[PDB]
Amino acid sequence: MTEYKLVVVGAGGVGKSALTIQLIQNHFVDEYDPTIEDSYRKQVVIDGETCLLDILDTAGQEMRDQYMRTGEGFLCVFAINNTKSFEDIHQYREQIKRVKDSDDVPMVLVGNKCDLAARTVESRQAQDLARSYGIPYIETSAKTRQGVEDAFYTLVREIRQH
């Protein structure tokens, strides 16, 4: 069946793992557990198509080129309460473009932790950025599960149209 190789990237502690686990195991992980590199394979049906989501959950800690080269689509995540994580996004996109020799790579910008009230990054800020990249912007919360499937499925549809 069709396999979609997705890679979740972004600064440390933004919730890359929490988002993935919610999608796969349907539960919110609320504990300190820094990732080195984990992969999740799940059979799913998206828009009537039977497919295998091969998800690579990466480390935020400063091996990148290797996984960016084989990835078909990327979920670039930042936390809406961490301005630095938002600014780091540029670095990730640039590295992905460089590795894939492409100006356009299936990508989705994800603003996570939208359940928190202490927001420091305005949605409009992220939307403008997303628009300049030419990619979708989706706000999520691994805690409430809002936008989770949305983020992942949109990335799949983006790969389908590339």
Per CB under 5 A, does 17 bind Mg ion? Answer: yes
Of 33-41, 43-51, 122-130, 153-161, the segment contacting ligand GNP by CB under 6 A is: 33-41
126 is in an annotated binding site: no
Per CB under 6 A, does 60 bind ligand GNP? Answer: yes
Instruction: Pick the closer one to Mg ion by CB: 17 or 141.
Output: 17
Under 8 Å between Cβ of 65 and 46: no
Per CB under 6 A, does 24 bind ligand GNP? Answer: no
Phi, psi of 46 (to 5 degrees): -120, 115
Q: Which residue in 115, 125, 150, 160 binds ligand GNP (CB under 6 A)? A: 115
Per CB under 6 A, does 64 bind ligand GNP? Answer: no
Of 9-17, 45-53, 95-103, 152-160, the segment contacting ligand GNP by CB under 6 A is: 9-17
Listed as own residue / partner, the contacts of 116-119 with beta carbons closer than 8 Å and 24 or more positions apart are 116/80, 116/81, 118/81, 119/80, 119/81
Of 2-10, 28-36, 134-142, 147-155, the segment contacting Mg ion by CB under 5 A is: 28-36
Per CB under 6 A, does 121 bind ligand GNP? Answer: no
DSSP 121: S
Residue 119 has a CB neighbour count (10 Å cut-off) of 13
Under 8 Å between Cβ of 63 and 14: no
Q: Tokens 């989501």, residue?
A: 53
What is the DSSP secondary-structure string of 28-52? ---S----SEEEEEEEEEETTEEEE
| Residues in contact with Mg ion by the rule CB under 5 A | 16-17, 35
Write out the binding residues for GTP.
Answer: 13-18, 29-35, 59-60, 112-115, 141-143
